[PDB]
Each structure stands twice: as C-alpha cells, then as structure tokens.
C-alpha cells in the first residue's frame, strides 16, 4: 500500500520496499533492505541510508521516512560498527 524507493549507490536499477502506513522508520527500512537482499547477519558490513539530493545521511534510526521517498543505500565494511542490530 506504501513504498520506499531505494538504490545501492553502485547499482543502476532501483528497487522498492512495500509496507503499510504513512512511513517507515530508518530502522525498519534498513532491516527490510537487508532481508530482501539476503545481506547476512550484519557482522560483515555496515548499511547507511542517504538522501539522493542533499547527500546527507539518515543517521537516526528512529526517524520516520514518509511514503514515496527515494534514498541511496551504501553497503560498507564493518569497522557497534556493523549492521547486526538490524538483524537481531
């Protein structure tokens, strides 16, 4: 019923995360992106979400991103410094 557009920064095509309501938390969006793409338990990478225009990061997992928004996704090495919190 609702959707958030995302694209990995090195990739050409854009994908969707489907959900219900006005928006998604940065936390749930990261969790869905990880599970939809089978990225793993989070010990091997970090996942960060960015604004395509301002290039600023969504650094607060409690922020609610409104429906129909687009974001850039970057999967980086693990340095908590990883992505395990979006899996447990």
């Amino acid at each position: 019923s609702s959707t958030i557009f995302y694209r990995f920064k090195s990739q050409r095509n854009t994908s969707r995360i489907l959900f219900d309501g006005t928006g998604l938390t940065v936390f749930d969006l990261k969790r869905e992106i990880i599970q939809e793409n089978k990225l793993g338990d989070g010990t091997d990478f970090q996942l960060k979400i960015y604004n395509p225009d301002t290039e600023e990061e969504y650094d607060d997992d409690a922020f609610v991103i409104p429906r129909s928004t687009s974001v850039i996704v970057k999967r980086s090495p693990a340095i908590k410094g990883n992505a395990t919190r979006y899996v447990t």
Partner: protein
C-alpha cells in the same frame, strides 16, 4: 610540488576473497581484479562497490580466472556504472568464457545468464599478450608471468613515470607445467603483493608430491575412496599430471580399471581443450615432452571424465577430483556428504581454503556436517581429513626473496588474513630495518578494506 598516489581496496584487504583494489594518480583510475567472497552468495559476496564511483575507472585488469579475482566481473559489466575497458591475458579470457555462467549464478542469488548478454559480458573484454605494453589514454600496463595457474599475470602499470607492480597471486617455485613469476626489467615505486601464507614455510615440490602420492596409494589399497576438492581448472591439472604419471609408474598395481581416477566437473571436456591449445605458453619442461612423444601430455591415460553423478556407479576404491574447491555446493559437496560417514575414506584438501567455507571447516575434523539440501539434518563425518598444499602461492621465503628483488620503497600487502598479513609485515619491516631512516627506507602497509593509503611523489 608533489602529487598524491592513492590506494584503497574494495575487497581483499586483510582477507582472502572478493579481491578489488583501486589506484588513482594524476587523474587516472585503475581497478585491479574483481572477485567474490566464496563464503557468501548474491550481493553479500561482492566487494564494497558502493564506496567508490565505478564510472571513474579507466581500465580494469584481471590477473587470473579464479573466483576470488574474476567472479564479480559479470556483475561489474552488467549492473554497475562501470564504463571503462577490461583487459586479461588470452588463456584467462578463454577460460573465463566457461566460468561465466557459474559466476553469474553466484552473484545473482537475490537473473540467469543468457546468450544475449554474451556480447556485453564477454566480447567487450580485450586481451593482452605477455610482455607487450598497452597504452590507454596515458595509462601503460604490461602483463608478466606469475605462475599460479594458466593465464595468470602480474601487471606493471606506469602513469606519468610512476611505476606500480601488482602481483595478483603468484608463485616462484618451478611448476610442472607453468612458468614461474619473473622480475620486470624496470624498477617499481610501489609493490602490491599477496600475503596468503604469511610467514609460514612449505616443503619442496618433490616432498609434497611424494607425500601426496603415498597418502593416496595407502588409502585406496585399504578400500577407501579419495575425494580431492578442486577448482574447475588450474591447479587440478597439476594434480592430474602427478597422478597420471604415478599411476603408470605402478600400472601393475593400479593400472587399467584398478581404482580409476575421475575428474568430475561440468567443465571437464572444455577445460581440457583450453589447456591443450595453450601449451606454447607453458614452461620448457612440458613442451619438451609435448615435442618428445608428440602426444599432448594433458591427454591422460589413467583418468576418465565425469560430468554429473547421474550414471556414476560407485563401488570399489576410486580417486575423485571434483569441483568446486571450497565444497560450498555442486558435485564435490555431494560426494563429501556421501563418503564422509565412512572412517577410512580420505578428503584431501590441496588448495587454500578461504575462511567461512566448508573446505576450511572440514579441516577442523567436526563430528558432523550439515547437509546442503537442508541444513538442520546433520551427516556424521568419520572420514580422514588431510591437507597437502598445491595452491601455487609463494611461501614466506619465496615471497621475501621476490620482494627483495623488486626493491620497491613502498610495499602494500593484500590477499591474506589479518594474522598472517600482520606477521608478514613485521618480518618485512624487520628485514628492512637497516635502511630505516635513510633514503632507501622501505615502507610497508597492511590496510583494511576501504582505507586509503596516500603516497607523495615527484
């Protein structure tokens, strides 16, 4: 007055796997290799491409066809903003053609390769001859012999006087069919060299071969079947040369149908014909016997080819060279789950088992292993597990001697786990402690992934 040389890896730094390194100097960008991590599948197996604008890469060089160096190339050329040119040696491309379909399937887990994408995924790849310099918009590069496997190359790159040598994976011990790595005639300011075995030492070839032949000979005599997990091709041909010669040395005991040898892979027929057509690019020891008997030494008398297990009658001892090498899936895993419940069967690992794979896990001798078709049902592992390296990597002494012959003032270590890499660094810094503080002081770097190493030059 000085300009910055920039190095950073998207993968394969402080680890073995998903090799991909970037060089920038005077507005030019070079990418070295494009592999995957055999411990993962889909995008999880890829280098951290999101951390770099791939559209800025001018040339992309592929050292050899192994999965941790080339399996990410179809993804780079099809799904990313990469637009530069791709180069590899002729045998590498000829071999890469048949690994292409399996490489795509590993990275596309989260579709399947078609004949239409064969134009962009393969035909666009350009080939270089050894010792023939190519110039692409001010970036010169030259392929040198590396050993390791057929088609493998070291690349010396020159950008505005600065010279960088990338070894890829290389060996210096004389192979039974490969030319060993060579020292480029011209000096290099930066050396990027592998660190797989760290400060460890390996035994000479004549010792590893005798240890390998006597081990298998003892196993098959007692009724045990031997499974050798190997990559689709490359080092597997070296083992086949050792076994086909040894089997005829003892043809009275194991000749004919007595314990047959099997090369199990869905690339068995085509992988051979590539080897038999690139003999002229091999060492003089193999072309002499190719000229002596005038018959191809890669036509094995005591080895038969098997493409699947659908019509494989398995009774009696037999030696099985099966792919994939890390036993992550495919055939070799199917026979592993079939032969490991018996205590006198032998699983002999001959290559480098990457962290997180079943080949690495089986060397810890677990009580059970999880079945591939469903994980929560275990299979008892009673078989004997051994390891005799034929991975064709330099050991400590071979690596240190080659590094000393290059004599670059800046060494960047890649392609090794953190502990063996860190021990190699200490030994190098200690070996070069005399020059410390002088004009020929050697700097050694062991960067992690996506960590920039900045060097200033003229």
């Amino acid at each position: 007055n000085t300009t910055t040389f920039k190095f950073f890896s998207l993968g394969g730094s402080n680890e073995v796997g998903r090799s991909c390194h970037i060089l920038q100097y005077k507005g030019k960008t070079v990418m070295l290799d494009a592999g995957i991590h055999p411990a993962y599948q889909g995008l999880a197996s890829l280098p951290f491409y999101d951390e770099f604008d791939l559209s800025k890469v001018d040339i992309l060089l592929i050292s050899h066809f192994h999965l941790d160096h080339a399996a990410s190339l179809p993804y780079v050329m099809q799904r990313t903003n990469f637009q530069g040119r791709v180069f590899m040696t002729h045998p590498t491309k000829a071999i890469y053609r048949w690994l292409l379909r399996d490489f795509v399937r590993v990275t596309s887990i989260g579709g399947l390769f078609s004949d239409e994408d064969l134009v962009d995924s393969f035909d666009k790849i350009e080939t270089v001859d050894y010792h023939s310099t190519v110039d692409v918009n001010g970036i010169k590069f030259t392929a040198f012999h590396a050993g390791h496997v057929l088609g493998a190359a070291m690349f010396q790159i020159e950008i505005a006087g600065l010279r960088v040598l990338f070894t890829g994976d290389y060996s210096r011990e004389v192979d039974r069919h490969l030319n060993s790595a060579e020292v480029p005639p011209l000096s290099s300011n930066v050396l990027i060299v592998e660190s797989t075995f760290g400060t460890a030492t390996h035994e000479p070839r004549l010792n590893r071969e005798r240890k390998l032949t006597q081990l298998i000979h003892s196993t098959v005599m007692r009724g045990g079947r031997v499974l050798l997990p190997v990559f689709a091709l490359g080092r597997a041909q070296e083992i086949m040369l050792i076994l086909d010669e040894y089997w005829s040395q003892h043809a009275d005991e194991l000749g004919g149908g007595q314990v047959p040898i099997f090369y199990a892979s869905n690339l068995a027929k085509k992988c051979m014909s590539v080897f038999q057509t690139y003999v002229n690019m091999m060492n003089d020891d193999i072309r002499k016997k190719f000229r002596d008997s005038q018959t191809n030494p890669f036509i094995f008398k005591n080895i038969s080819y098997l493409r699947n297990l659908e019509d494989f009658q398995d009774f009696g001892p037999s030696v099985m060279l099966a792919s994939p090498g890390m036993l992550q899936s495919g055939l070799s895993r199917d026979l592993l789950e079939r032969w490991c419940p018996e205590d006198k069967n032998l699983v002999l690992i001959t290559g480098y088992s990457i962290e997180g794979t079943m080949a690495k896990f089986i060397m810890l001798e677990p009580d059970t292993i999880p079945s591939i078709n469903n994980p929560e049902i275990t299979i008892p592992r009673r078989c004997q597990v051994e390891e005799i390296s034929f991975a064709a990597h330099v050991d400590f002494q071979e690596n240190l001697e080659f590094i000393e012959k290059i004599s670059a003032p800046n060494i960047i270590l890649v392609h090794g786990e953190a502990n063996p890499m860190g021990r190699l660094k200490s030994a190098l810094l200690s070996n070069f402690a005399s020059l410390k503080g002088t004009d020929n002081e050697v700097h050694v770097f062991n960067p992690r992934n996506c960590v920039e190493v900045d060097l200033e030059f003229q």
